[PDB]
Write a protein that binds this DNA or RNA. Sequence first.
RNA 1: AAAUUCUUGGACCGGCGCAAGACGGACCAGAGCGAAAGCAUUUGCCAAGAAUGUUUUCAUUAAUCAAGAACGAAAGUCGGAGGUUCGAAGACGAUCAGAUACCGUCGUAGUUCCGACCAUAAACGAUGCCGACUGGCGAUGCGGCGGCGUUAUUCCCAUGACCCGCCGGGCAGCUUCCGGGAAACCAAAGUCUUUGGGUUCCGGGGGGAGUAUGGUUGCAAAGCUGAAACUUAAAGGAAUUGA
RNA 2: CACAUGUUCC
Lengths: 25, 98, 101, 149, 91, 83, 129, 149, 106
Amino acid sequence: MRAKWRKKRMRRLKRKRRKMRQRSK
Amino acid sequence: SLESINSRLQLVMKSGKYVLGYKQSLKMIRQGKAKLVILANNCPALRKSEIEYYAMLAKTGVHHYSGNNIELGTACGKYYRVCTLSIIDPGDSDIIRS
Amino acid sequence: TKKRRNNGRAKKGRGHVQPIRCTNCARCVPKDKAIKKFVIRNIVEAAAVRDISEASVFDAYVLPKLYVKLHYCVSCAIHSKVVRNRSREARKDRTPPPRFR
Amino acid sequence: GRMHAPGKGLSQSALPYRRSVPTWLKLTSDDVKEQIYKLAKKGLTPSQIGVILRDSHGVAQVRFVTGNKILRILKSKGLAPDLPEDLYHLIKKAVAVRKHLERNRKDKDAKFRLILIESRIHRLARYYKTKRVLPPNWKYESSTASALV
Amino acid sequence: AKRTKKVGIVGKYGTRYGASLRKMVKKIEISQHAKYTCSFCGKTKMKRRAVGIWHCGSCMKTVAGGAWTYNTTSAVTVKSAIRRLKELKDQ
Amino acid sequence: PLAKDLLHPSPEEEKRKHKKKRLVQSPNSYFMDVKCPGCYKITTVFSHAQTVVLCVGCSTVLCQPTGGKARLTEGCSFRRKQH
Amino acid sequence: VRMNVLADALKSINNAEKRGKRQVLIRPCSKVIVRFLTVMMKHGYIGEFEIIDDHRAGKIVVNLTGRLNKCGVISPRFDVQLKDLEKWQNNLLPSRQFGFIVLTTSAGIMDHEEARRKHTGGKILGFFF
Amino acid sequence: PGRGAPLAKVVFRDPYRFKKRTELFIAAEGIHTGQFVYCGKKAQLNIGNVLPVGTMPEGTIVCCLEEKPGDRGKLARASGNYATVISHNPETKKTRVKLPSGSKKVISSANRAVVGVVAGGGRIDKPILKAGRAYHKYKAKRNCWPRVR
Amino acid sequence: KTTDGYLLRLFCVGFTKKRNNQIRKTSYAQHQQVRQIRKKMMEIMTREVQTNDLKEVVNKLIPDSIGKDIEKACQSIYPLHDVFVRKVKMLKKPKFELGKLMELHG
RNA sequence: AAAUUCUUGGACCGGCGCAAGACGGACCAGAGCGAAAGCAUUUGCCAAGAAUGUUUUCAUUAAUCAAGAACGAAAGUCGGAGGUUCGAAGACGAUCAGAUACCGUCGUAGUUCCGACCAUAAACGAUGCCGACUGGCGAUGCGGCGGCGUUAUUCCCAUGACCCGCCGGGCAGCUUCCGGGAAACCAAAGUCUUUGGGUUCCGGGGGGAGUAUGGUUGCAAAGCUGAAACUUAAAGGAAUUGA
RNA sequence: CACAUGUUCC
Ligand SMILES: [Zn+2]
Ligand SMILES: [Zn+2]
């Protein structure tokens, strides 16, 4: 794992948590 | 040489005698006291031709100023627009010799 | 660690220089970082320079040359053996190789 | 070491050691002052009287010939201007940049340059507040500064 | 005090028409009722009376301009371009 | 080298050093007695006068502003003075 | 800019002493520096100094001997009591046989032995040995 | 009413009878009341001055262009629209002129057009917000607004 | 444009020359010198072309008579040596009538 | 290497033109300017700027700065204009065990211009800013000073182009046992156990983790601040010898 | 034009 793509994986995972938390409210 | 004229105007305001406005300056041309006329470029064309005709009879030099009346008041150190300026006494300036 | 004091480029006070492409590939290389070769060469070198001369209509006609300013990248120049790696003391030498042939 | 530039240049005047009047100068203190009063009457900032006097009139320094300096002589007779010369030329420069910024609002370099004079104007403004040469409530206002030349 | 946070003239529209439509209207809606500096008198008395006309409250002088702004960006470029070719013809 | 004569610097290198960086701060400018060929009167002119100089009666110009020393008008005799 | 003046003078002659210059020039002349130089001369640590008094902050040319190891400066000028003056010289001077801490008192500027004789404290200036 | 382009009343002098003739022109942007608008072949090139296309230089911005010689202007006369001169042709008296649709049309050099863009430009950038603004817009023009799919 | 309707776009090139006794490798010129060179370097074309028609300026292109004058006139600014006019381009011709071509063809 | 692709409906190529939109080669440099990002066709306009020169003016007006503010590569977003070339996505043809990659033909967004956001880069000299001292050597940019001389305007003074030096800083380079550092190396990374010129920011083994939560900005993407539970005896830097 | 990968102790 390159340090660049694990940051990109985090942003895709963080954005996934953004949609999941938004639909509950 | 435009910046030199603003320096001449500033010098006349603090020391020499001057008349602001159109109507009050038209009397001074008629009494013959004024020697130099300053006219903004945005003055009415009828008023531009009448001032030069009044000064031609009085043998008074007219200097057509570069900009409009809004900046002409700031060049005179005032806070209002001026279209016609007549210098009664330069006092300590060389504005009439240029 | 630091390999080169100038980091393999001539940029000292600029901070940013315009990039140029390469000759073999289309690699975007900075102008001061690129290995720049300027070759003065004839169109024909050894064999064709002779037979065309008597075949030329105009006697004693000098053949025009060809001027190409080459721009190689680090990978391209080394693979094409334009430049090669040197020892740590031999790196600091920047004089050109001797020119006689 | 300029305070708003990365330059560290060294170029300024260097007065000679002797404070005595030059031997070629025959103009007395009052004759220099009436020459100073002549230049100040026709309109001239005290920087320029010192310039042309050493060029044509041949004086070394006004402080050595007379008892006082150029601005101090004008202050005694009341011919000094309302506000000092270094603040005046900064406000004049700030007006020209702002006037240029009215037309060329894409000039981000000129936009950055504008704050530097207003930074420099305020440093001179609060310094002159402590020296009591300006009123204590004086404040450089950008819109009404165009009235001053 | 400041009555609204980030809506100005488009506060009369309420929650209708959406945020983006109210946002892009705001630039035009402000400019179509703002006053501009008279080129003849100097008094800022350029008020829009109808579509494409701009009237002076001092000189009683109507100037044909843009629909929302006093001068459109295209027309200013045309005026500079026509003047440039005017002196190019007669030299 | 270690030992130097900072007590009494030599004339040759004192003029070489920068005017502020001298042991005693001394200027490189001077004054001269300019006499134009058009007239007779003697005028005192700064060496870096950086301004236009005109003769008495507006006869002829004397010095032109430059980046350094003022360029004398040709044919004007000048004699450097000191005090 | 130039915040402290004595600090620049002491480090300039310390750099010359490390290189071993016969004499050294310092650009500012102050009353404190002149008093500082007179403290070291009575003990013979340096060669004889002279000042060049122009119409500005003068320049001081100090002849140097080879007897100087290091002349430091303490900034800021902490006040020194008579009780902890032994504590100051314990961690600053190399030994108790030599080394001199000079500090300004109301009686004047002198080393730490003379301040003990006059029983007067003050603010510290620097150390030299 | 029903037209976004403003109209200007221009009064002429009849050269054959003692009378003043008024016209209804399409106001170019920049036209003010009390301004001499010229009309003819020997006219000068400035905004609000109609003259034949064959006399114009290259790339002249025009509006109210005639598509035939003598039909009083038909092309490029909506609000904010204009036409440009592409290329002249001295023989056959023809000139290429492009239209606001982008198509390039060869037109005769005898017909004329008024120099400038039509005033009232930029009308379509403002979004209609409610049905009322669109209802009142088409009510002045014709019964064509309520569109059933 | 010439006296007749031959309107031309000319092109010239200049090159600063390293002096014979010059030791300095750079041999560059100031930006204002280039602007002072090129203002003299352009007006020479307007002097040679405007005074006559194509028959003489073409006769000036067989030698470097336009480029020789450019080289010597700008010696007081910077001694440039390698001067030629590099490109002459036709832009607009007048109506072709055959009588003009005959005196150009004998 | 082939194929995808065009081609007797004439492809490719040559010549004459026309139109569109990009870009500014060689000159171009361990050169110049700019706070940085960054800046390369000619000319004109506007304002600004460093350095030099100064026996010109004021007289401490100064240095670093939290809060705050301006600018801020590319990519990305929203409105228009335009879209030549290149080209994320995608389609197709090759290669391979597979390519969803590297190769080739197209090609949306984008790359181009204007008006607003966005404030992130290996945004590097991986080296905060102001002041002083500490060896030389040859260059180079600018300005100034002096001097034999060669060469232009020609009609020489003076100005240009060279040559020989000096001065200030401007980017750098070379060199050595100053000195320092773990070493690589450094005229600063020195003037430090002989430890203090001044003033900000910032780090405390490695992960978790720039994560969760809270606050704040943004149209969005995301930007700023920012843990703990738990886990681990090493991780890491320079240098030598083998492989 | 392809050459992908081979548990732990000294
Ligand atoms: Zn390459
Ligand atoms: Zn009006």
